[PDB]
């Protein structure tokens, strides 16, 4: 239940990485291990040479406090970095627990590969099962799909030539955009809003390539999301596997989700302006 | 369509001795009205030299 040999984390989990000018930024774990090693070696030397009892007890106390600090900091005093930087050191328990620890970032997958984000503008010309996607960011998002599809044709010989062709926008061709339209014929993408209060904050859509910068959004989902058009942005993700494509297109597509899960009240209801128009046209 | 200056080397510079910036010069040139008298004629290159 008490520990005799203390494990030492693999170096890459606490790497010393040079920042600039030879200086090295280090994880505090390295400092804690260094202090522990120094205390342990001092204990070994002191016990080897001679035993002044009070001194031996004192150095035992320092070793014990070093181990305790390494396991976690704060429960007994606050061992800190070198004086002048009064930031308490970060220990194992600090890495695990907390509002942003190991648990609250690997539970989360804070980073994804094929993602983008942009401001959103209304897309009234669109049907409900569609959304507008800027051609440049869509081209970037489907890059492997684009490479494969234009390799199906003779636009480029190999993948490296195609990537170098796409690596600069001065080499774009209308054949490239034809291929991009070819890729996304049946594909869907997930549109997402940052505060995801309920199940409808993620919705799949059929992308439509547009010329512009903003994301064109069907107005009827203006209430499914709490998304007005006062400058708020949305993110977009691109599922890869065919199995995931089927999932999104069948049970996440906005055309199939018209009623709340909180109650039978519809959320695809006509919004403010449509209501105004229909009331105007059906009044006596 | 296009503007060339013997002195400057980009759009956001300024000519010494000129009160207006290059931006102002281009904006003023934007309102210049040119009437062609030969319908077959397509592209013309007017020249301007001034001092003092």
């Amino acid at each position: 239940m008490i520990l005799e040999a203390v494990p030492v984390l693999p170096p890459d989990l606490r790497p010393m990485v040079q920042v600039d000018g030879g200086r090295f930024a280090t994880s505090d774990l390295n400092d804690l291990y260094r202090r522990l090693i120094n205390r342990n070696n001092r204990l070994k030397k002191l016990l080897a040479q001679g035993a002044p009892e009070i001194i031996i007890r004192n150095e035992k106390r320092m070793l014990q406090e070093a181990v305790d600090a390494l396991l976690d900091n704060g429960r007994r005093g606050a061992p800190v970095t070198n004086p002048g930087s009064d930031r308490p050191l970060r220990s194992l328990t600090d890495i695990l627990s907390g509002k942003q620890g190991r648990f609250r970032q690997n539970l989360l997958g804070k980073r994804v590969d094929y993602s983008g984000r942009s401001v959103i503008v209304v897309g009234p010309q669109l049907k409900l099962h569609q959304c507008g996607l800027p051609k440049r960011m869509a081209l970037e998002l489907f890059k492997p799909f684009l490479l494969k599809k234009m390799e199906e044709k003779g636009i480029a010989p190999n993948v490296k030539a195609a990537r170098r062709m796409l690596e600069r926008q001065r080499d774009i061709k209308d054949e490239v955009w034809d291929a991009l339209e070819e890729v996304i014929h049946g594909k869907v993408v997930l549109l997402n809003r940052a505060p995801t209060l309920h199940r409808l904050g993620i919705q799949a859509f059929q992308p439509v390539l547009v010329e512009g910068q903003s994301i064109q959004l069907h107005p009827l989902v203006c209430e499914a999301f709490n998304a007005d058009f006062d400058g708020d942005q949305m993110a977009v993700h691109v599922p890869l596997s065919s199995f995931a494509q089927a999932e999104a297109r069948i049970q996440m597509l906005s055309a199939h989700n018209l009623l709340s899960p909180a109650s039978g009240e519809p959320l695809a209801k006509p919004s403010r302006d449509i209501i105004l128009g229909l009331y105007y046209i059906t009044q006596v | 369509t296009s503007v060339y200056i013997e002195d400057v080397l980009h759009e956001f510079s300024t000519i010494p001795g000129v009160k207006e910036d290059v931006v102002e010069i281009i904006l003023n040139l934007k309102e210049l009205v040119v009437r062609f008298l030969n319908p077959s004629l397509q592209t013309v290159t007017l020249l301007l030299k001034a001092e003092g």
Binding site: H129, D178, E182, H185, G186, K187, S242, F243, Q245, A246, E247, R249, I250, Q251, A255, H256 | -
Partner: protein
């Protein structure tokens, strides 16, 4: 959308069965290639610029268009499952 989703939902008890059926059909189409289809002769999907939906622009729509016919049968255990599930992943 897709041809008659209402008909799709009517002909299965629960939607997740429908999703797994359509996607497993899509995976079968991918692995065997699009030769193992059961709507081949006349009614095939078609692109606009050319006839590209003959081969493989989108397999999910292929599977769903397949399922609207009576040529697809699905069940919890209709075939010895072990044989198929251990030949599927090695090709």
């Amino acid at each position: 959308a897709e041809p008659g989703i209402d008909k799709l939902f009517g002909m299965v008890d629960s939607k997740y069965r429908l999703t797994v059926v359509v996607a497993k059909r899509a995976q079968q189409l991918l692995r065997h290639g699009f030769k193992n289809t059961v709507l081949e002769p006349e009614e095939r999907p078609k692109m606009q610029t050319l006839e590209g939906l003959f081969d493989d622009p989108n397999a999910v729509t292929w599977a769903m268009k397949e399922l609207l016919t009576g040529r697809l049968v699905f069940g919890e255990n209709l075939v010895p499952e072990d044989r198929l599930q251990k030949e599927m992943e090695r090709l």
